[PDB]
Amino acid sequence: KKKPLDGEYFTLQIRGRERFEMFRELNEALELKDAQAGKEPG
Amino acid sequence: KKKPLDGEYFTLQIRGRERFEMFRELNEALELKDAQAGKEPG
Amino acid sequence: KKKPLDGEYFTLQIRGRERFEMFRELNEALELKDAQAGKEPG
Amino acid sequence: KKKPLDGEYFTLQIRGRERFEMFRELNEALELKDAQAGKEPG
Incomplete structure (x- = not known):
């Protein structure tokens, strides 16, 4: 669905709900x- | 080092470097x- | 154009272009x- | 108090208190x- 090549994904830890x-x-x-x-x- | 009880940690995916x-x-x-x-x- | 009552507006100073x-x-x-x-x- | 030349200041309108x-x-x-x-x- 669109977006041919997926860009590099990342992540981030966030303390506190x-x-x-x-x-x-x-x-x-x-x-x-x-x-x-x-x-x-x- | 301070911070007795650690609060619940979380995470979030961020596309793009x-x-x-x-x-x-x-x-x-x-x-x-x-x-x-x-x-x-x- | 939609948005009947306008909510209170505010402002914030941001140093640096x-x-x-x-x-x-x-x-x-x-x-x-x-x-x-x-x-x-x- | 420090900060010799003041950088250009700006502003931004934010609706909602x-x-x-x-x-x-x-x-x-x-x-x-x-x-x-x-x-x-x-």
């Missing part, structure tokens, strides 16, 4: 932008 | 604040 | 998520 | 790192 949800949130945020980056500007 | 360094940076940032949180206010 | 672009990026990131939050799940 | 506190938090986080960057490594 509530704090973890915060980092993951920013992760999906930027990922959302990159997702619409494949759609023409109009 | 350059992007990874960015997330890790914010991680050490907040961790730096919590580190000085154990020092009296003066 | 390159650093500024970084913060603004995360700003548009979360804003992008909230933008698709008004669209039904399918 | 609770959300604002979140951004400001990351701001002080990186600023805390830069603060210890002036102290020798030991």
Whole structure:
């Protein structure tokens, strides 16, 4: 489904349960932008 | 060394090498604040 | 255009030109998520 | 007090009161790192 070559994946340890949800949130945020980056500007 | 009970640890996958360094940076940032949180206010 | 009552707006000073672009990026990131939050799940 | 030439300052609008506190938090986080960057490594 799109994305031909998969870029190198990485990982990061985040102490704290509530704090973890915060980092993951920013992760999906930027990922959302990159997702619409494949759609023409109009 | 301080920190008696260790809080639950977690992890997060971050695609992209350059992007990874960015997330890790914010991680050490907040961790730096919590580190000085154990020092009296003066 | 949608968004009836405007929520209280705020501001934050960010020293550094390159650093500024970084913060603004995360700003548009979360804003992008909230933008698709008004669209039904399918 | 240290910091001879002040770097160009900037600003960013953040909608949402609770959300604002979140951004400001990351701001002080990186600023805390830069603060210890002036102290020798030991």
